[PDB]
Amino acid sequence: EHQAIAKMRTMIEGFDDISHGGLPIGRSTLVSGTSGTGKTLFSIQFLYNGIIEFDEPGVFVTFEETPQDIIKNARSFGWDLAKLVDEGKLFILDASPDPEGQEVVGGFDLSALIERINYAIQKYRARRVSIDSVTSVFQQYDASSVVRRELFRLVARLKQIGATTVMTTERIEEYGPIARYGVEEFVSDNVVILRNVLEGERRRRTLEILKLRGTSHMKGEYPFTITDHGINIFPLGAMRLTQRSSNVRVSSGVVRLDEMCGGGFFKDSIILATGATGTGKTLLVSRFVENACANKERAILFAYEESRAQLLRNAYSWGMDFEEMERQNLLKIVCAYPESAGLEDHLQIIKSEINDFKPARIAIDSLSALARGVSNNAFRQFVIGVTGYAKQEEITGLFTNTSDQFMGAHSITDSHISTITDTIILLQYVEIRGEMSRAINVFKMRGSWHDKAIREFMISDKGPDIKDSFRNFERIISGSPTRIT
Amino acid sequence: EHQAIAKMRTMIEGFDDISHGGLPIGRSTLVSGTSGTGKTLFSIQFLYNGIIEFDEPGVFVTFEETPQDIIKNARSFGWDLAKLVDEGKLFILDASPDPEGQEVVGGFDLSALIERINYAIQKYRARRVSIDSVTSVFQQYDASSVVRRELFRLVARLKQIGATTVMTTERIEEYGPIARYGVEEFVSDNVVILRNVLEGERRRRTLEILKLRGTSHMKGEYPFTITDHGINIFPLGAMRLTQRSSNVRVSSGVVRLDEMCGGGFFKDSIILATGATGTGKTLLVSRFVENACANKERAILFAYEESRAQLLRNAYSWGMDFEEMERQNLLKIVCAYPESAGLEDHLQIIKSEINDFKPARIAIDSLSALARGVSNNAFRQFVIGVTGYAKQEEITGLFTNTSDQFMGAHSITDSHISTITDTIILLQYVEIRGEMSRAINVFKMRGSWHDKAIREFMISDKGPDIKDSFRNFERIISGSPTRITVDEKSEL
Amino acid sequence: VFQQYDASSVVRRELFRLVARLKQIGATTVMTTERIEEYGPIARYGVEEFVSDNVVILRNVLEGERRRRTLEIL
Numbered sequence A: 001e002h003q004a005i006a007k008m009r010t011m012i013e014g015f016d017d018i019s020h021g022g023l024p025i026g027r028s029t030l031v032s033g034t035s036g037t038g039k040t041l042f043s044i045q046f047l048y049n050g051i052i053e054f055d056e057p058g059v060f061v062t063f064e065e066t067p068q069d070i071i072k073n074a075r076s077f078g079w080d081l082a083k084l085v086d087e088g089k090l091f092i093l094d095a096s097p098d099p100e101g102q103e104v105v106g107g108f109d110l111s112a113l114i115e116r117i118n119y120a121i122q123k124y125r126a127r128r129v130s131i132d133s134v135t136s137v138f139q140q141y142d143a144s145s146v147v148r149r150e151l152f153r154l155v156a157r158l159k160q161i162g163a164t165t166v167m168t169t170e171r172i173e174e175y176g177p178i179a180r181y182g183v184e185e186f187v188s189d190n191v192v193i194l195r196n197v198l199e200g201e202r203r204r205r206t207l208e209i210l211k212l213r214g215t216s217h218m219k220g221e222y223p224f225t226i227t228d229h230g231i232n233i234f235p236l237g238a239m240r241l242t243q244r245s246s247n248v249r250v251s252s253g254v255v256r257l258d259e260m261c262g263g264g265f266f267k268d269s270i271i272l273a274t275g276a277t278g279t280g281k282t283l284l285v286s287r288f289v290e291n292a293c294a295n296k297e298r299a300i301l302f303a304y305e306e307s308r309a310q311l312l313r314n315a316y317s318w319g320m321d322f323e324e325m326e327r328q329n330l331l332k333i334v335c336a337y338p339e340s341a342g343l344e345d346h347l348q349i350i351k352s353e354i355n356d357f358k359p360a361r362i363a364i365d366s367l368s369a370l371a372r373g374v375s376n377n378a379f380r381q382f383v384i385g386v387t388g389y390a391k392q393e394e395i396t397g398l399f400t401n402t403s404d405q406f407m408g409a410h411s412i413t414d415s416h417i418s419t420i421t422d423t424i425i426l427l428q429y430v431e432i433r434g435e436m437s438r439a440i441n442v443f444k445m446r447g448s449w450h451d452k453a454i455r456e457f458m459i460s461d462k463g464p465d466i467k468d469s470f471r472n473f474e475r476i477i478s479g480s481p482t483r484i485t
Numbered sequence B: 001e002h003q004a005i006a007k008m009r010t011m012i013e014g015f016d017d018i019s020h021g022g023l024p025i026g027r028s029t030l031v032s033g034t035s036g037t038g039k040t041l042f043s044i045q046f047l048y049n050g051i052i053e054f055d056e057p058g059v060f061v062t063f064e065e066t067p068q069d070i071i072k073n074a075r076s077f078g079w080d081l082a083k084l085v086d087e088g089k090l091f092i093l094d095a096s097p098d099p100e101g102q103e104v105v106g107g108f109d110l111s112a113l114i115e116r117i118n119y120a121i122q123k124y125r126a127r128r129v130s131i132d133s134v135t136s137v138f139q140q141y142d143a144s145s146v147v148r149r150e151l152f153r154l155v156a157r158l159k160q161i162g163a164t165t166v167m168t169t170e171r172i173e174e175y176g177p178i179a180r181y182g183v184e185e186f187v188s189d190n191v192v193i194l195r196n197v198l199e200g201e202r203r204r205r206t207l208e209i210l211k212l213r214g215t216s217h218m219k220g221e222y223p224f225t226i227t228d229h230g231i232n233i234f235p236l237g238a239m240r241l242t243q244r245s246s247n248v249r250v251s252s253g254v255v256r257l258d259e260m261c262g263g264g265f266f267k268d269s270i271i272l273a274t275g276a277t278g279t280g281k282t283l284l285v286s287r288f289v290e291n292a293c294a295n296k297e298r299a300i301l302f303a304y305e306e307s308r309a310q311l312l313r314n315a316y317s318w319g320m321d322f323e324e325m326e327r328q329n330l331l332k333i334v335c336a337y338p339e340s341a342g343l344e345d346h347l348q349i350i351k352s353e354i355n356d357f358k359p360a361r362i363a364i365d366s367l368s369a370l371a372r373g374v375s376n377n378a379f380r381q382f383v384i385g386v387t388g389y390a391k392q393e394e395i396t397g398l399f400t401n402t403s404d405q406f407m408g409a410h411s412i413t414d415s416h417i418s419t420i421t422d423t424i425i426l427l428q429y430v431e432i433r434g435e436m437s438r439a440i441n442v443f444k445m446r447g448s449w450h451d452k453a454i455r456e457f458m459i460s461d462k463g464p465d466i467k468d469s470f471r472n473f474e475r476i477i478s479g480s481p482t483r484i485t486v487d488e489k490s491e492l
Numbered sequence C: 001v002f003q004q005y006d007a008s009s010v011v012r013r014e015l016f017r018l019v020a021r022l023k024q025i026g027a028t029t030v031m032t033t034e035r036i037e038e039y040g041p042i043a044r045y046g047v048e049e050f051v052s053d054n055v056v057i058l059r060n061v062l063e064g065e066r067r068r069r070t071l072e073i074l
């Protein structure tokens, strides 16, 4: 044809954005990865989504797994392929070998198979084809050049037939050659690499479109997660800087704080509370989560440092009954150890729960605990993710950070998140006469005026009481002021 | 079946959590690793727990070790296989070669072996199968493709038989190919990798479930230990943030402290005492452990810096008789150099002893010492483990930390554990008039009010005496203050 | 000895034969092997590791021009 290469949607979450529309129609895409990367799942989801969203029949050619198994496995994702096979929308073509045995039936090899796939295609009026582990077929006794030819032959016949195909390959090195024979890379029109990178005893799955002959696509690796719903990719670099921005205000749950912020936090905003350990970030969170219930709004408190029970003990000791918020179905507590997941996973759990609960406010107690272990770059990516999501969803977010050093801290954040944020509330210890007092300061607020004082404050059962500034002192920011008389 | 694959529990501690229920029934799981990683043990434990806990017979196929040796080595874990063989619950089928000699044993091999296996399975009504090192079978003269097919044949036949199987393979590189031929990884539906990673001159064993076709499972490596009870895995990432939390108070063993903490520590709480060397962390510990005996409760003191003798000399000089606490069976001391093991080992020793003694209190004199060498992330993981265990077990835990720099310390912890902890007791030196005095502060307390004073304190034979704050000083925290007030008293 | 002209599988069989006969005889044996890399495969043919009951690795590590010998029971 005379125009811009057309793409078939995969409907696999996030993939069509990365690929700028989908898989190129009528050509085949190589998808390779090491064991357990999700090659097989990709290729099934491509067919399954075809059938269920466009009523495009599919043909799935298997060389190793058994059709019963392919079917059985899909149940993991709540997919009934046996039904689809019955309705004639899906056809799994068994090309695996005889557990029993013979060695002279496939002397007509590529040729013959190519006929059965063409027969199947015509028969079911197939639009999508997935060949699972072509690699395993020549893993009979071949050399690079022999593979290049067979692959080419196949790709080509399918091109003639007009089918959009997904071919699956295996690799042994996460960052080494693209597929086993260092030849499939160049014979396909498109290449997709699925990686399961190790790094620190944790595993991180990434998907990469290495090339799409004829169109554009997002470059590099994107994290993804295999869930009950199959492959889920987050193109964190595909999120646009187009979030809605209002002037409406909301309370912090602490009136005086509201005053200092020039009448409260903005609804559309990302508020950061930083401070040495024990300064009172968590008390603010409690208070901010409570204010959303007293106004009959839903709030989620994602906790990564305290148990659901402890959170309740400490909250109740500050007034506020978290128990009720729970029943009233106005407040939801989560709680998990940063270690019980990858940032990718965490991010999704968060999104996920936000979707099932549709909160108005959200508080993540200690981003600084989520940064444990992870790389700064991996972590920043996470923050932009959760931040950006809350921002485009009109949810007001309160995030917490504990600074590594009490008193004398020379930066707002050790991870340098402060720019990714709209409002920064800052808590610090101040040594006043052999005692450790606290001080709160609205460091910055983006669309408002806010107070510039570093007010001292106390914590009682009643909660946070913000008092006055240390007017008669110098170097209050050092943590060790110098009362000047 | 219209259901997603079901799993068989291995009962191997920690494994069913990592594998979300067990191994997939009717399929085979490839377990591979380098020499001495624990392959053979995993496979034996899988059959053993199969028989002892569900009365599911097992067939163990062996290609290299002798049935007598497999039975003999299992005695290391208190397992009498010879008995089970006897009662027809376990059947070791010997597939090893005879120390004499025959050629061309590749063909009939698989097939014969397969009905030998089928025969045995059918004969004993086996539900579980372990094939030990299939690897060694084609290690007769083969190339990758021949391996791939043979494997496939075998797995397949077993699938047909309906057996849940554990297959074992060797590797030569800790992070190299999954299994010798670079082919086994793909033929198997499930793959488990046992690693015995070096690093420093210590070895750390990890288990990873790489893939389970059909279901979910935890990802990554998990440290485990081989013990007299076999493989023991700690899914430190599977521990849930659901620990019970009470408002009950308990004493620190120092009244004045108790006041400062708004009436003593919380029963449910992790306490951290920090400060430069010689400030008295160990004194606080001793006192905290004694307090649990004087109340006839059990306490364990895991010490990593002092001998059991030294602890006793120093204790007695502070009053408190550790001798009695011992006899009375209320106090138990441990002691061990951080270097005499890996963090995984330590964590387990701690847990183990907490189970045999059921303490109400526990103190670890110096986390800081356990941090010697180990990486920060390995360490933090360790702390969350001991910390969380303590917490879900209602045991009050006091941990100690020596800061790397006396005076001027700008962070509570050098390893940044301060967020993992409920109450923080800080000890510091204060230079006052050419002399080194001490100060004690309750830096933070999660559920109470605590005192914000940086009180000076002395140490005598009576123990710790907490005096008053340094009100007329600026830069206390810095360790080197400055006195103030320029108006003594004059006329009108 | 097999450094005469052999491949991995031939070595595994021969070793196994020897070790086996020795165990029958009732002897407690120490068998020595060479390696070329201080941290690579355990022994030459990457096969002796699994054929023996116990494995001990002697290392002589370089690192900064000094040499440090270590013994490990693997």
Ligand SMILES: Nc1ncnc2c1ncn2[C@@H]1O[C@H](COP(=O)(O)OP(=O)(O)OP(=O)(O)O)[C@@H](O)[C@H]1O
Pocket (backbone or CB within 6 Å): A033, A034, A035, A036, A037, A038, A039, A040, A041, A042, A076, A077, A226, A227, A228, B185, B186, B210, B211, B212, B213, B214, B215, B216, B217
């Ligand atoms: N419901 C589920 N929830 C979470 N993860 C799942 C679920 N089902 C399967 N998985 C995961 O997905 C993986 C499946 O990968 P898959 O079968 O797609 O093919 P593959 O890894 O590409 O290739 P191979 O045929 O070599 O195994 C499993 O290893 C497992 O980690």
Ligand SMILES: Nc1ncnc2c1ncn2[C@@H]1O[C@H](COP(=O)(O)OP(=O)(O)OP(=O)(O)O)[C@@H](O)[C@H]1O
Pocket (backbone or CB within 6 Å): A276, A277, A278, A279, A280, A281, A282, A283, A284, A305, A314, A317, A318, A402, A459, A460, A461, B418, B419, B443, B444, B445, B446, B447, B448, B449, B450
């Ligand atoms: N009932 C109470 N009465 C007086 N002060 C309290 C009370 N509860 C807590 N506090 C004070 O508040 C502090 C608790 O801090 P909080 O739980 O708000 O979290 P944080 O400082 O933000 O974070 P983290 O606890 O992880 O360091 C304690 O140090 C203590 O001084």
Ligand SMILES: Nc1ncnc2c1ncn2[C@@H]1O[C@H](COP(=O)(O)OP(=O)(O)OP(=O)(O)O)[C@@H](O)[C@H]1O
Pocket (backbone or CB within 6 Å): B034, B035, B036, B037, B038, B039, B040, B041, B042, B076, B077, B226, B227, B228, B229, C049, C050, C074
């Ligand atoms: N009771 C025990 N306590 C602690 N460790 C033990 C005990 N018994 C055995 N071990 C350890 O476990 C190891 C046994 O490993 P195992 O026999 O399970 O198989 P392998 O290493 O997987 O394979 P192979 O030795 O056949 O190459 C020993 O090397 C030893 O380190």
Ligand SMILES: Nc1ncnc2c1ncn2[C@@H]1O[C@H](COP(=O)(O)OP(=O)(O)OP(=O)(O)O)[C@@H](O)[C@H]1O
Pocket (backbone or CB within 6 Å): B276, B277, B278, B279, B280, B281, B282, B283, B284, B305, B314, B317, B318, B402, B459, B460, B461
């Ligand atoms: N009988 C005593 N009388 C007066 N002071 C004592 C007595 N015993 C110990 N001390 C003092 O207490 C200090 C001992 O410190 P302690 O045993 O409390 O542990 P630490 O400071 O926490 O840790 P570490 O000893 O490893 O540095 C000595 O430096 C000394 O000044």
Ligand SMILES: [Mg+2]
Pocket (backbone or CB within 6 Å): A281, A282, A283, A305
């Ligand atoms: Mg907190």
Ligand SMILES: [Mg+2]
Pocket (backbone or CB within 6 Å): B281, B282, B305, B365
């Ligand atoms: Mg000490």
